[PDB]
Every structure is written in C-alpha cells, then in structure tokens.
Amino acid sequence: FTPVVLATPIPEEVQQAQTEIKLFNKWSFEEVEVKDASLVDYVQVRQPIFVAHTAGRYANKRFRKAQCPIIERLTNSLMMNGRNNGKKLKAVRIIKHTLDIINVLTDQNPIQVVVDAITNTGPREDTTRVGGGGAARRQAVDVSPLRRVNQAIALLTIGAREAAFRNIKTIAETLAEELINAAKGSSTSYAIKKKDELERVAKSNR
Amino acid sequence: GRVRTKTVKRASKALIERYYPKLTLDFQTNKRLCDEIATIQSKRLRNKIAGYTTHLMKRIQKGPVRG
Amino acid sequence: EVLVLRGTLEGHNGWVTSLATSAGQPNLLLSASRDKTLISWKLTGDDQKFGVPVRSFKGHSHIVQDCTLTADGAYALSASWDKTLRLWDVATGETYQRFVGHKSDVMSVDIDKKASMIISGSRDKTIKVWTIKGQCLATLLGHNDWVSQVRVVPNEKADDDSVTIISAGNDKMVKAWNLNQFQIEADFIGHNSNINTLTASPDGTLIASAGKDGEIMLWNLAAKKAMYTLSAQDEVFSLAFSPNRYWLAAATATGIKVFSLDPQYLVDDLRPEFAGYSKAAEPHAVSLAWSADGQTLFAGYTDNVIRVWQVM
Amino acid sequence: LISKKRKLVADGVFYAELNEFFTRELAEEGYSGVEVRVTPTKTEVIIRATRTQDVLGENGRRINELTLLVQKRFKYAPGTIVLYAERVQDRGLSAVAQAESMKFKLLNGLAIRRAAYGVVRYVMESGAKGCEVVVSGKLRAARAKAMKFADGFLIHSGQPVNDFIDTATRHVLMRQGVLGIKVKIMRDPAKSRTGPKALPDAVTIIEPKEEEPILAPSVKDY
Amino acid sequence: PCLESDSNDLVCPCGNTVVPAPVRCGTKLPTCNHPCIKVVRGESTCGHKPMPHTCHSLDVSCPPCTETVFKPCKCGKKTKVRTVCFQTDVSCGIKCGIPLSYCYHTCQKTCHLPGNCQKVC
Amino acid sequence: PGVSVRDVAAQDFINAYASFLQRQGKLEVPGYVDIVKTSSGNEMPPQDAEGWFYKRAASVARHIYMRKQVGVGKLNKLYGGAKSRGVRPYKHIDASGSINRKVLQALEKIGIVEISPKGGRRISENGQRDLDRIAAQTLEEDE
Amino acid sequence: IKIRITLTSTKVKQLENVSSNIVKNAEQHNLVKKGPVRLPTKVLKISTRKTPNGEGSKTWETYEMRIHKRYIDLEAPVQIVKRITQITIEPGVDVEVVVA
Amino acid sequence: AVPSVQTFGKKKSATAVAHVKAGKGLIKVNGSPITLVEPEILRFKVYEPLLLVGLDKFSNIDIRVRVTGGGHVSQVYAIRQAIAKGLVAYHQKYVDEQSKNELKKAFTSYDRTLLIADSRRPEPKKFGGKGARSRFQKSYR
RNA sequence: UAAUUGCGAUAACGAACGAGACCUUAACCUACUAAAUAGUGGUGCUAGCAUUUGCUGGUUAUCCACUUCUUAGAGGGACUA
Ligand SMILES: [Mg+2]
Ligand SMILES: [Mg+2]
Ligand SMILES: [Mg+2]
Ligand SMILES: [Mg+2]
Ligand SMILES: [Mg+2]
Ligand SMILES: [Zn+2]
Ligand SMILES: [Zn+2]
Ligand SMILES: [Zn+2]
Ligand SMILES: [Zn+2]
Ligand SMILES: [Zn+2]
Ligand SMILES: [Zn+2]
C-alpha cells in the first residue's frame, strides 16, 4: 500500500479503508458465514457498509427488509419505547460500542457473534390461535425464516432494553452480554429462554 | 388498478378504425400523431389514449381483434 | 465476399436513432439515440469490443432524432424532438450554435458539403435552411404531411452548377429542391405508404426511397424518371448506399437486407442472434451507416446497442 | 401606504360590499352583476342588468344618485368614481337574473310549478345545456319539503363546475315563512369563447380525407 | 483612451479593409467579410477552388478543401477509393493477408502500410 | 501552508483558546460570576465555576470570526436553550443578555472584536491574527 | 431615468399579457431593460370550520387567494414614460410606476 | 479559463452545491476540510464517495461544497451526493466516457442515493389528527 | 378493477348523473425566457495565516460575466414504457 497526498490531508486509517470496506472501519464482513442454511438468504452480510446508518427504503415491498443489512436491522430495533423513537445516531453509537465490547469480551468477530445470536434465537416452531368453539385454543405451526430473523432481533433487543432499565449497566453493555449469551446458547439469555418457552408451548399444543 | 375507462377505449378504437396505416407500434410516434389528429383536452388523457392505441396495434399485429 | 458480425458497441439506454461517419476520420463514429444524447466512439478494429465511447454530448431535452458529421469530423449536428437543432464541437462537447424556429419535432438534419449551410426537415411540414451562425436563411413549404427525412445530393463534378436537396414525408410523395433559388424542381409520385427514409447515391444519380409498405423505390433524378422497385416484404427504417460498391442496405423490421445492383439480387440478408425476445419480438435495426471505405456497416438497433458487420 | 396583501383583500371586500348593495337595491331592475375597473384618476363600476332604462332613470338620475351613494359611503373624491349601466346578453344564461325573476313571480302569486317550469323553459330555450331549479320550504302544508324541476343535463363534480355551472340562491319571504330558491344553469361549453370549449372527457377525432390509390410511379418536373 | 496613436494603417491579408492613420493604440482591425485572397486566386494543390470562406488572419488555419477524390490505398489493392481532398488516409479495406515469414499464418491487417506487416502472430 | 480557525475542530479550538485567555488573565471577568445561571431557561449555574467565562469568550470570539457581525440579541438566541416549564411543554428561551454584552465588551477591551458598521461586533485584525495563531498552535499540538 | 413598474395582480394570464406587451413595447422603442422579475407567489390562507354552529365532525376548510407580483426596470425618457403609464390598463391588474 | 463544473445534491430540504475545478486535491465543506463534518458517527458517510473510487481520482481536482437547509443528517447526505455527482460531471466534461461510466458504475453498485436523489417527500398533515395519517383519539361514552 | 372500472354475455337499444376524466399541490428538467428584492464566478479595494503562485474572509455602485443552486412564466416528461 502507498498513501496519496492531497491538499486536504486524509488520515492513514481512512486511507486504509480504500482497500476494504469494514463496519466502523474495524470489522471485516469477509469470513462471516451464517451457520443455518435456513437463515442464509435472510441474514444479509454479503454487502459491506462503513456505518449502520443507510437511509434505505425497505418498507415498500414485502421482502426488501431481508436485503437490508442485518447490523442496521439491529440498530433500527434499538430505537424503541417511545422516548427513543427516532434517534438513530444514538442507536448507531450504541451498536458501535456493543461491537467493541463483544470483541473485547471474546476475541471473535463481533458481526459473527451477532449472526450467531440471531441464528440461535430464531424460534423454529410457534403456535396460533384458532376458533376452538368459543374458547381460545392454540395450534402449533411452523415459522418462516424471515419471521425467525425478525423475532430473533426483537427478542434480543427487548431483553437488552429490559435488563438495561433501572440498572448501572449501560445499554451497550447489556446488549453485548445478551448477544454473547445468545450466541453461546447459554440459557442465561432472555432471547434463549423466550425461544425455548415458545417452542415448548408449541410442542404441548401440537 | 390500471383498468382504462370507456372514453380511452372508445377513442382508441375510433382512432385505429380511421387511421390504421398512418399510426405505428411505437408510443412516442403514436402520441405525436394523436395530439395533432385528435382534439383531446388533457395531456394525461392524450397519453392514455395513445398508450392504449399502441397496445391495440400490438394486438392487431398478433392476429385480428374483435370489434 | 460476405458480411460477418464482428462486434457490438454499448453506451446507450435508448434506441440508437442515427449513425454518422466521416471520411476525414475513419476511426470516428457518431451515434444519436433516444436517451437524449449523442456518443462519439473511437473504433479499434479488433475483437468483441471493437470500439469505445470517448465522448457524450448532452443538452437535448427530448429524443434526438438524427445526427450528421462534417467531412473533417470536427463538427457534428443533431436534430431532436425538442424542436431545436444543435451544432457540437466533436473534440470538447461544447455546443457552438442552437438553431431554433421549427414549431414541431425536427426529424432530419443535414450539413451540405463545404460546410456552407444546414437543411432540417421537421414535423411542422417544413424544410428550413440555415446559416452556420444560426439564422434561418429560408424555409420551404408545400409538403403536405410531416417531413421524415431531408438529404443533400452529392455533386459528382466539383461544384458543377448548383446544389440540390431531396426530401421524403408521410404524404407518399418525395421531392427534390434546388435551393440556389429555393424552388422545387422534381416531384416523384409513386409511394403508397408513409415514407420513412431516402438516400442519394455517391454518384449523385440514384435516389432510393422507402417506408412502411416495404417497397424500396429507385429513381434516376438525372433523367427524373422512376426506374423500378425492390420488395423487402416488411417495414424498412433506414437505407444506405455503399460508397464504393453497388450495394444498398435496408434496415427492415426482421433483418437488414442488402442488395447488389448489378444482377439485382439479395446477397446476404443478415439476422443477428439475441438469446431472448422470442416471446414477443426481436429488436430490429432502426439506423445504419457504411464506413468511408465501405468495409464495415454499423447498425443501431432498438435494444440500445450498435452492431457492426465486416465484409470479406 | 398599505401592503399588497391587505390592499388586495380590501378591494375584494369592497367588491363584495358593492355587489351586495347593488343586489339589495336593484333587485327589480334585473341586476345581474357588477365589475370594477381601476384606472389612473378614475375607477369605473359597470353594472350588468336587464332594465338599463330603469337603472338610469330620467337623464341618468338614478345613476347620479347611485354614484353619490357609493361616493359618500366609500369616501371617494368628486370625479374619481363613475358608474355605467350595461344591458347583459343571454339573460336566460344568468342564474341571478332567473332566481330574482322567480322570486318576484312567487311574491306576486304565481304557482310554484308554473313559475319553475317557466324559468326552466326560458333557460332551456336560451341555449343552455341544462337547467335545474329547486324550491324548498312550507309548500301548501306546515311540514316543509323540497321540489326539483330539471331539464337537460347538469354535471356536479370537478373543475367543470366552476367552468360551466352558474348558481344562485334567493330567499322568498312568504306570509307563512321563507321559501328557498336555488337555480343552477349549465351553459353550453361550445359557446364559451373564453377558456375551454369542451368538457375534459370529450374527444374529437377528425375525419381522414380519402385519396385514391395511385398505382403508378410518375415524376412532375419544373 | 490611450494617447499613443499608430501612424501605420492596419492591413488585412486581402488589403481591402484598412484602418486610416492615426490609429488609436489597441484598435482591432476587422477582417474582411470578403473571401480570402487565396480563395480569390483559386490556387490550391487539389486544383479545385478552396471552399469560399471569409477572410481571416494568416496565422489562423485556412479551412481545407473537401472534394471526393479517388486515391490509391496504402495496400493499394485498389487504385481509386473515394475520399476527401484533405485526407491522406485512403482505405481499400481489404486485408493484405501476406504470409508472414516467421509464422505459418498471414497478416490480416487491412490496407497494410507498405513495409508494416505484423510482427507478432 | 497557513491555517485558520476553520481548519481546526470547534471543541478543541475553543478549549485551547479559553485556556490561553485564562493563562493570559486580562479578560476582566465581571464579578457576578459564580452568582448567575447564563439563562432564564437554565436551572443551575455553570459547573465549571472558576472558568466558563473564558469558555463563553472563546466561543463568541470564534463565532464572530466565522460570521460578518454579531450582536447581543443574536448571541442570546444562540446560547438560549429549551426551558422546562414544569408541567407545561418545553420552549426555546433566550440566554442572559448581561453576560453576552459584558463578554463582548471584554473582547473589545482586549482587542479581539470591534464595533462594526451595520451594527454589532465584527472581529478586528488583531483578533483575526491571534485566533489564527491559536489555531496554528492547537493544530500543531498533535505533532 | 430609472423607472420601475410593479404589477401585483391575482390573475396570472392578464398579468402575463400586461408584462408581455410592456416588454415588447420597450424592445420596439429599443429601450434597455431588466426583464420581468417574477417574485415568489404569495398565498393567503384562511382556515375555518365548515359548520355555522358547532356540531358534527370537525371538518376544516382552507381558502386561499394567490397574489402574483412582477416588476420591470426601464431606462426610458419621460415622454415614453407617460405613454407607458397611459397605456396597459387591465381590469384586476394593479400597476404602479416609480422613479429613482 | 480553469476547467470547472457545478453540481448539487439533495435530501429533504437540504441542498449542497459543489464547485469541482482543476486543482491539487482540497475537499472543503462550508470552508472547512472534509475531515471535520459534524456528526463524526456519520463522517464516513461523506468519506465513502472518496473511498469507493480511490483518492487518486481526487488528487488532480479540488472540490468546495456549500450546504444549506434541512438538518444535520440530511445535510450529510446532500454533501455526499453533491460530491459524487460533481466527480461524475467532471469526468463527463473533461475526461472520457469510459472513466465516467466506471465511476457511475461503482457509485451505483454501492448506493443509488450517491447519484440519484431520494424522492421521498413529506405527506401533508390533515385536519382532525396530529399527523398525516394519525387521528385524534375517538371516544364513544 | 379502487370503482355498474372494464372484457364480455345478453329482451333490450341508445343515453344521463355519480366513479374516472378534471383542478390545486409535491417530486424531475445542468433544455427556453430572465433577475442590484435570488444566487454564483471573476476583477477592483482590503484583513489574517503562509510563501513563488496558496488558503479562509470582508466590501455591491467597484465593475464585468453567468443562471448550476433560487424564484416564476411557457413547455417537456409517465402511457404502467
Ligand atoms: Mg439502568
Ligand atoms: Mg446550548
Ligand atoms: Mg419531551
Ligand atoms: Mg408525526
Ligand atoms: Mg470580492
Ligand atoms: Zn481581407
Ligand atoms: Zn485562408
Ligand atoms: Zn479539393
Ligand atoms: Zn487497402
Ligand atoms: Zn501485412
Ligand atoms: Zn502465427
């Protein structure tokens, strides 16, 4: 590599960024694989981004949110419970800190930890309400992979937000151990426990 | 939906009935001749009429059309 | 000898409406398209690439209908559906002159040899003739439907007596004008449909005019009498004479029919392969132009490409 | 020394007040409207009515008193305001004139159906595309109801309503209460001469002139 | 305006238009709308008359002659090929196809400039 | 190559110039400093008690450097913030005029700004040169 | 001479034809002029409840009056100045001419 | 004179006007270098027009951008669009069509909003509710 | 089909209103006409930092040029190609 000198000088690390696009100029999207063959084509990690803020239109068509990058989908789900509606700058800062904490706590690629958490906590079977003759009965059904990704993200971020509320731990830290425990399947994760409970209820209601 | 009303359909059929060899299978030329060969009060209505006319010319090129 | 497909040129996203070449620069090709632009290409004479775009000319606000080059290739002219003409510096883009005054879509432009003055036939049933500086020196009326093409007749002798132009419109009537004094001299009757195109031979004695009925009608304007008609059996959009051989190429809706005239028979009748479009309709050539040496035939199609053919 | 917004709103309210004054006093003269033209040193008020001789009076005496009235009220200098009377054309195509004539017929004692059919026949005879007159109120009974009388065709929605329908409303003060008169007139778009000559959805295809096939190539020379 | 005045008339190449002395400093002679003196002579190597163009300064390039003339090609398989007068590049358009010495194959470059056959096959 | 205030990030430039003014020590800090809040929309005084006037001075000096001419009302709007009106909704409230007027006068006395035609205060040439020198030093500190 | 003509109507077509015949009279008299500067159209809005009383669905209604303003700068002698201010009288078009 | 082009980029109400002229490589936004654009979490969003094609494209030209209107993030998006469109327009006018097409292809393959403005516009608010779609709360008793 | 919107079928045929068309507004135009009440570039005058030449500014009577950005008028553009 050779640096190039401009009249407005450009720092060496962002000049390094010309060779490869990395998340926050730190995390390579290469060598990240989705372990679940069902959740590949619905977890999007093939297109790299510098920042988890793309003003993209994924709501017009039925399946464009699958082509939305998965880090920005996690970021979007962080902007919840009314007071934080909007505030994507706060959400992307939280995501950046979360990835740093993940890499510190385990030497793995934090994007790989995120996709492992999503693949591990997508609920594989669920149940739906039927008529049942005036009383609610629940009939076990299967879950489509897009719904598995959506509900995995919702469970992970809801667990992080609930465990960060009224706590000295920050939201980035709480999301970091939430994603780490879900990636291990450690059952100390909120999302792992919720996924297990839903699958158990569906198995009972077969 | 993109269903075209009877004003467009009837104008297109009348245009084809009395101007078939003059007009073509191309929307741009059909538009450019329709605006001078008919009196249509709206550019939008002229575009819709010329488009349905071009569609019917494709239909006519693929065998005859009833009506 | 036979024509063989050599390569394609890809820079447009609309129908390639016209092609122009220059004797001065045998490696230049100018193409005007439906994407409101012109492209000047540099030819390489090699494998599948065969040529690269070196300049785009932008500034027309609608479909640019045709284009011509001067003999040296320094200046280009474009006629467009925005009711204007434009003169471009081929080296630097750079519109020198805007010609305004037509009241409808100008469909044909042609510089005369010697770069003296410009004719343009439009959709308001007029043929306006202009100076280089951009003033309408005259307008020609009396042509009852809208004009499809105008062309200049090349003088075999070096400026023998005068300069004449020919024109075809949609009133099934082609015309020949002496614009030394702005009169009509020849009025050829005989077409039965909208005439799309007409071409004068490099000899200056043959006129080929053709349109939607598929009848390529030949005229000898030296004697001012009709000679015969060829049949393409389908709509034909462009005609061009080979500058050295006795060949006439016609861009029909199904192929490009090229005819030699000394036995008067069809020689090749080339049809390219598209790998697609089979359900509705194959794209067809809407423009074609020979080279200055008559060895390569360029053809601009409706699938926004230009295909080239080389003779053996 | 006034802003343009306030000036244009002020002369709008001046037009509205002047029109209300003229329709209050010139009701029995067939008052059909008013127009205002400002001019350096003079503003002119064109009254469009039917009985211009009654609007004028002897040597324009009523015109002089109307100029003096509008002058005294609107604080104009002497000579700065001038009124002209003008006989309106196409009296059948004037909803205000037809509504006032129907009001005076009902006040004089004509039957409601006879008056309404007279006005709709007059408007249809005057070349309108359609007419519609509605009479609402206590008609022959204490319970109120509405009667509709139509002829021709009238449209109701879109920009052609502003273009072609003229409407007017009047209050008739009968001894049992108030009747309401509504008059809608759709004029022929072809006779407009100012604006669109047709409805938006009207498409006219011109007839192609037929020419004989020539079947023979020939050359004309000069 | 500058005090200095040229005592010499400004002369166009034709000489038809001159600026009478005294000429104010910085005055620009207007070139003749009349044709170029060379055009009036009609002299040209092509033997035709140059295109009739307005008079211009000698430093400015003269517009060239443009007459379709038939010239022999670089390969020369063809004696006459239609080209403009100014153009020196005439093309028969036919590959010379001369068996290369070094290779079994021939040289396909068309209109080979004499002595310019391809070096690599 | 030459620098200016626009070549340096706002926060660290303002910190460097405020520290420079505090070390120079001729700004005539008014005296009701440590009493006041800087805005009617504030509820607590500035936490950096012994400073904050040099911070406001560096901020208004850089602001006038970037602009053409700035007055006290523009400064009050610039430094005013959202007031919490108890149980009613929040609202924009202008900052204290006395603080901004006195810091403008203090900068005039040390020669950074001056009275401009068309009103307000514009930066003087001495203010331009020493703000530029501070920019040079704070861009050199990282080397 | 520095005169400026300001036209401030609500009728776009009458405004535009007044501007057009002023500018063609100016070029016919060969007067140097700054062309018709068209100011932003100012829209006067009034929003009201439709109902005269106060019941039913709360339906609102916005009325608007559009004011179109143009001005032309002219450098012409005084006789053409009076002839300009004596010609181009249009109903509904408010015209004013100012000097210096 | 000096070869130069002017372009613009847009996002909502933010407009950025970029002057791209022949020069030595300075990229300035509102008179300050590109390395000081205000949300530093979004600084790479205006870096990425430079990074996708390489800085050798910017070595021989210099770009000055003035942005107004809108808010912080929309001004960032307008800046990046103006810079990318300015580079493409310069390569259109003074460099060849091959280079212009390669630049356009790289920008389009990464992000369509680098060259084509996002067409999403605000929907007007309607009466009877706080927003365009949302309505006031309905009660029945 | 959003639509008695259409394809059609058919003791009905031909019509009218409503729907649609329409009109206002928001999106595009490096195409036209322009702008000292919108801007931009250059030249004057001038400040600071640098040092050949540069960078950031100030000043409109200091003049010139232009219309990309801005404002309109006139048009173009989509018709599901
Ligand atoms: Mg907490
Ligand atoms: Mg604050
Ligand atoms: Mg709040
Ligand atoms: Mg809202
Ligand atoms: Mg200056
Ligand atoms: Zn001369
Ligand atoms: Zn010469
Ligand atoms: Zn010659
Ligand atoms: Zn040869
Ligand atoms: Zn050879
Ligand atoms: Zn070989």
From Swiss-Prot, chain A:
Component of the ribosome, a large ribonucleoprotein complex responsible for the synthesis of proteins in the cell. The small ribosomal subunit (SSU) binds messenger RNAs (mRNAs) and translates the encoded message by selecting cognate aminoacyl-transfer RNA (tRNA) molecules. The large subunit (LSU) contains the ribosomal catalytic site termed the peptidyl transferase center (PTC), which catalyzes the formation of peptide bonds, thereby polymerizing the amino acids delivered by tRNAs into a polypeptide chain. It is found in: Cytoplasm. One of its GO terms (molecular function) is rRNA binding. The modification Phosphothreonine is found at T8. It comes from the Eukaryota. N-terminally acetylated by acetyltransferase NatA. It comes from Saccharomyces cerevisiae (strain ATCC 204508 / S288c). One of its GO terms (biological process) is regulation of translational fidelity. Signal peptide: none annotated. Belongs to the universal ribosomal protein uS7 family. One of its GO terms (cellular component) is ribosome. Component of the small ribosomal subunit (SSU). Mature yeast ribosomes consist of a small (40S) and a large (60S) subunit. The 40S small subunit contains 1 molecule of ribosomal RNA (18S rRNA) and 33 different proteins (encoded by 57 genes). The large 60S subunit contains 3 rRNA molecules (25S, 5.8S and 5S rRNA) and 46 different proteins (encoded by 81 genes). This is Small ribosomal subunit protein uS7. There is a cross-link at K26, K184 (Glycyl lysine isopeptide (Lys-Gly) (interchain with G-Cter in ubiquitin)). Pfam families: Ribosomal_S7. Coiled coil: none annotated.
Curated annotation (Swiss-Prot), chain D:
The keyword Ubl conjugation applies. GO terms for molecular function: DNA-(apurinic or apyrimidinic site) endonuclease activity; RNA binding; structural constituent of ribosome. There is a cross-link at K103, K129, K138, K148, K197, K209 (Glycyl lysine isopeptide (Lys-Gly) (interchain with G-Cter in ubiquitin)). SUPFAM superfamilies: Prokaryotic type KH domain (KH-domain type II), Ribosomal protein S3 C-terminal domain. GO terms for biological process: cytoplasmic translation; maintenance of translational fidelity; nonfunctional rRNA decay; ribosomal small subunit export from nucleus; ribosomal subunit export from nucleus. Changing K105E: Impaired ability to rescue stalled ribosomes. The modification Phosphothreonine is found at T41, T67. It holds the Pfam family KH_2. One of its GO terms (cellular component) is preribosome, small subunit precursor. The keyword Protein biosynthesis does not apply. The modification Omega-N-methylarginine is found at R143. Residues 18-89 form the KH type-2 domain. Its main location: cytoplasm. Disulfide bonds: none annotated. Keywords: Cytoplasm, Isopeptide bond, Methylation, Phosphoprotein, Ribonucleoprotein, Ribosomal protein, RNA-binding, Ubl conjugation. The modification Phosphoserine is found at S94, S126, S218. Ubiquitinated at Lys-209 in response to stalled ribosomes. Ubiquitination leads to activation of the No-Go Decay (NGD) pathway and degradation of non-functional 18S rRNA: first monoubiquitinated at Lys-209 by MAG2, followed by formation of 'Lys-63'-linked polyubiquitin chains on monoubiquitin by HEL2 and RSP5. It is found in: Cytoplasm. Belongs to the universal ribosomal protein uS3 family. PANTHER family: 30S/40S RIBOSOMAL PROTEIN S3, SMALL RIBOSOMAL SUBUNIT PROTEIN US3. Present with 146000 molecules/cell in log phase SD medium. This is Small ribosomal subunit protein uS3. The gene is RPS3.
From Swiss-Prot, chain F:
It comes from the Eukaryota. The lineage of its organism: Eukaryota, Fungi, Dikarya, Ascomycota, Saccharomycotina. Component of the small ribosomal subunit (SSU). Mature yeast ribosomes consist of a small (40S) and a large (60S) subunit. The 40S small subunit contains 1 molecule of ribosomal RNA (18S rRNA) and 33 different proteins (encoded by 57 genes). The large 60S subunit contains 3 rRNA molecules (25S, 5.8S and 5S rRNA) and 46 different proteins (encoded by 81 genes). Belongs to the eukaryotic ribosomal protein eS19 family. GO terms for biological process: ribosomal small subunit assembly; ribosomal small subunit biogenesis; ribosomal subunit export from nucleus; translation. InterPro entries: Ribosomal_eS19, Ribosomal_eS19_CS, WH-like_DNA-bd_sf, WH_DNA-bd_sf. Changing I64P: Lethal in double RPS19A/RPS19B mutant, considerable decrease in 18S rRNA production. The keyword Ribosomal protein applies. GO terms for cellular component: cytosol; cytosolic small ribosomal subunit. It is found in: Cytoplasm. Pfam families: Ribosomal_S19e. The keyword Glycoprotein does not apply. The gene is RPS19A. One of its GO terms (molecular function) is RNA binding. Changing R121E: Decreases mature 18S rRNA, protein binds 20S pre-RNA complex poorly. Lethal in double RPS19A/RPS19B mutant. Its main location: cytoplasm. It comes from Saccharomyces cerevisiae (strain ATCC 204508 / S288c). Keywords: Cytoplasm, Ribonucleoprotein, Ribosomal protein, Ribosome biogenesis. Present with 29000 molecules/cell in log phase SD medium. There are 2 genes for eS19 in yeast. This is Small ribosomal subunit protein eS19A.
From Swiss-Prot, chain G:
Its main location: cytoplasm. There is a cross-link at K2, K13, K82 (Glycyl lysine isopeptide (Lys-Gly) (interchain with G-Cter in ubiquitin)). Keywords: Acetylation, Cytoplasm, Isopeptide bond, Ribonucleoprotein, Ribosomal protein, Ubl conjugation. It is found in: Cytoplasm. Coiled coil: none annotated. It comes from the Eukaryota. One of its GO terms (biological process) is maturation of SSU-rRNA from tricistronic rRNA transcript (SSU-rRNA, 5.8S rRNA, LSU-rRNA). N-terminally acetylated by acetyltransferase NatA. Also partially acetylated by NatC. Component of the small ribosomal subunit (SSU). Mature yeast ribosomes consist of a small (40S) and a large (60S) subunit. The 40S small subunit contains 1 molecule of ribosomal RNA (18S rRNA) and 33 different proteins (encoded by 57 genes). The large 60S subunit contains 3 rRNA molecules (25S, 5.8S and 5S rRNA) and 46 different proteins (encoded by 81 genes). Belongs to the universal ribosomal protein uS10 family. This is Small ribosomal subunit protein uS10. It comes from Saccharomyces cerevisiae (strain ATCC 204508 / S288c). The lineage of its organism: Eukaryota, Fungi, Dikarya, Ascomycota, Saccharomycotina. The chain holds residues 20 to 119 of 121 of the full protein.
